[PDB]
Amino acid sequence: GEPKTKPTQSSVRELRGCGLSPDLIVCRSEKPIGLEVKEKISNFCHVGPDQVICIHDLNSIYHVPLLMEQNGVIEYLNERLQLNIDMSKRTKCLQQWRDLARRTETVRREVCIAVVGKYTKFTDSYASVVKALQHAALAVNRKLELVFIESCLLEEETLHSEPSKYHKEWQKLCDSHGILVPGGFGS
Amino acid sequence: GEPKTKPTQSSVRELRGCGLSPDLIVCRSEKPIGLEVKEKISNFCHVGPDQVICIHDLNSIYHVPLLMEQNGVIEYLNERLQLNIDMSKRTKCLQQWRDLARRTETVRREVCIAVVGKYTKFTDSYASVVKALQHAALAVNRKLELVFIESCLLEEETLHSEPSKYHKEWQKLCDSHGILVPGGFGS
């Protein structure tokens, strides 16, 4: 249960074995962890304890600007490289991202939408497609529920073998509103 | 949560209003209720408190002989009408029913079996059919899972309206091993 990170102490050895020295703090998580592990990386990297990034990314993009305004990294890189800054509200303009982040989590519909990919796991046919179409659907305030329908096991390989994964896929597309078209992988 | 019975006190008024007098105890339940209500019916009928029947019938037939051996009704009717009795183990022979009671609740298979009746509620097309076939299926020690397949809303009245429900019954009949034939109600 304790978040004991292993690649952290292993990445420092690789940098020392070639002729490099780590200066920043790199991390990746999905839930706010305790403060008992924030000071563990500082002593192993000889950095400041108040500069540890605790990112809890899930599956969108609005889980990043909410962290920079709490730790204190938006003003550290300004005086580190001596660059200009157009101050107005908080270093950079944030009102443009707040109007699209809070408004997104206030809509719901749960409409049956059937999509066709290729396999059942996370493939590469809709990694950047399902993300761009979700932001443009905020004008109608409607949420689309994405499912997983495989077109491979649907022909004679399923109807002749075990008719279990065939008749179930047709139960989520007869009353749907948006039916997509897949592609083609040889034969 | 208190099992307050109403037709009990109302049935006594109907018998007294015509020239009858109740003597036995009639009841119907599904789970062993407490003893706080067994003395409520005895004073309303002026009968014996140790002769109240607490039947907990669910949906079979073996939930009846297990109660007569606990309350005490198998010997009450013998001396009430002065009749003969062939004593051996406990008034009547019980070994014939005890062999089919434990052998029934110790078999399982969970196999997909699709049956077609008429509607979706408890109709009159399989009331006495699903009970007789279950006892004869004990020789193979296999359990048949009964479902509900409606043949009315399946033709053109469903495919044109909401065909999502049409593809629901086909998932349980194509994979099943036994398919029955319904009947015909006019048109």
Swiss-Prot record, chains A, B:
Task of the protein: Catalyzes the ATP-dependent amination of UTP to CTP with either L-glutamine or ammonia as the source of nitrogen. Constitutes the rate-limiting enzyme in the synthesis of cytosine nucleotides.
Organism name: Drosophila melanogaster (Fruit fly)
Lineage, highest ranks first: Eukaryota, Metazoa, Ecdysozoa, Arthropoda, Hexapoda
Lineage: superkingdom: Eukaryota
Expression by tissue: In ovary, expressed in oocytes, follicle cells and nurse cells. Also expressed in larval and adult testis (at protein level). In larvae, expressed in lymph gland, salivary gland, regions of the midgut, testis, optical lobe and trachea. Isoform 1 is expressed in adult testis, ovary, accessory gland and head. Isoform 2 is weakly expressed in ovary.
Changes seen on gene knockout: Larval lethal.
Family: Belongs to the CTP synthase family.
Shown stretch of the complete protein: 189 to 375 of 627
Protein known as: CTP synthase
